């Protein structure tokens, strides 16, 4: 009997940034969906490529856990065949994406009143990222006659910026923690089963 390492992922005190979304392995473990459903109550659930009820007996070879936080109004960005700032300049995925995504809210849990700038996101980048690509560089995106300096303001775009999330803001502006379970049913040994 092996305990799946899902509690820490689903109960992590802190979450990684959008440009540094946490990636975790899931293999060589046994998990039960009934206990998770009984003990976990998510808000938004969306699965492509497999029915929610078919996971009972499916012998998934491996799973990738991608955890991050985004803005509520940007929740539409994460979807197949979608174009946007988050999709292109921060995190790009294949158009024919398959897997599950669970999104929840921590407005009350993370109701840090006063300068809640713990979340940072890349404003823009020179080029468009490819599927399953990431970068943590601080290159200055000048694209103009402005001097090549890291100044935040008009006529000078900083590579990164802090989201203005507050508890009193609108619902669409509230933070959303998203965990994506990506399935790769390739020609590899099966290690996860019920």
């Amino acid at each position, epitope marked *: 009997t092996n305990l799946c390492p899902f509690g820490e992922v689903f109960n992590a005190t802190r979450f990684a940034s959008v440009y540094a979304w946490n990636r975790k392995r899931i293999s060589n473990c046994v998990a039960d969906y009934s206990v998770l459903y009984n003990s976990a109550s998510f*808000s938004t659930f969306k699965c492509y490529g497999v029915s929610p009820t078919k996971l009972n007996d499916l012998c998934f070879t491996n799973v990738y856990a991608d955890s991050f936080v985004i803005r509520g109004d940007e*929740v539409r960005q994460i*979807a197949p065949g979608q174009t946007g700032k988050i999709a292109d300049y921060n995190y790009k995925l294949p158009d024919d994406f398959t897997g599950c995504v669970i999104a929840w809210n921590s407005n009350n849990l993370d109701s840090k009143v006063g300068g809640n700038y713990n979340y940072l996101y890349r404003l823009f980048r020179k080029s468009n990222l490819k599927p399953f690509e990431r970068d943590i560089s601080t290159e200055i995106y000048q694209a103009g006659s402005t001097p090549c300096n890291g100044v935040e303001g008009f006529n000078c775009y900083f590579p990164l910026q802090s989201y203005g999330f507050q508890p009193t803001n609108g*619902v669409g502006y509230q933070p959303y923690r998203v965990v994506v379970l990506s399935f790769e049913l390739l020609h590899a040994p099966a290690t996860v089963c019920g």
Partner: nanobody
Amino acid sequence: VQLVESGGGLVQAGGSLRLSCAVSGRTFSTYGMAWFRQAPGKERDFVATITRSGETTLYADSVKGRFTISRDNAKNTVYLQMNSLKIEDTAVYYCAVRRDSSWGYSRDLFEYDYWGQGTQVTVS
């Protein structure tokens, strides 16, 4: 192209009505129908929804087990039945067909089209 919601009126205690909601479009397969309660100048409560698989379904904390959800493919008409009325279960009923094409278990209102007219009943 707009959603039709026939019927209405006022129902007192010991009464029943069928909320006939119809979709004008012929792409009923791609509409992830989902329902939610509507209130005047107040938060919108979540309601159960029929799973895309058809055989299965969903349960909502506010209301569950008191709605005769039934998918329709011929005329895209759904008769949302109301039973065991209560103050918690009493509110301005609305048929909000979702234009998105995806599996739906959402609890937020960020992914709905519009709130046009809605319907309700009057209780003395």
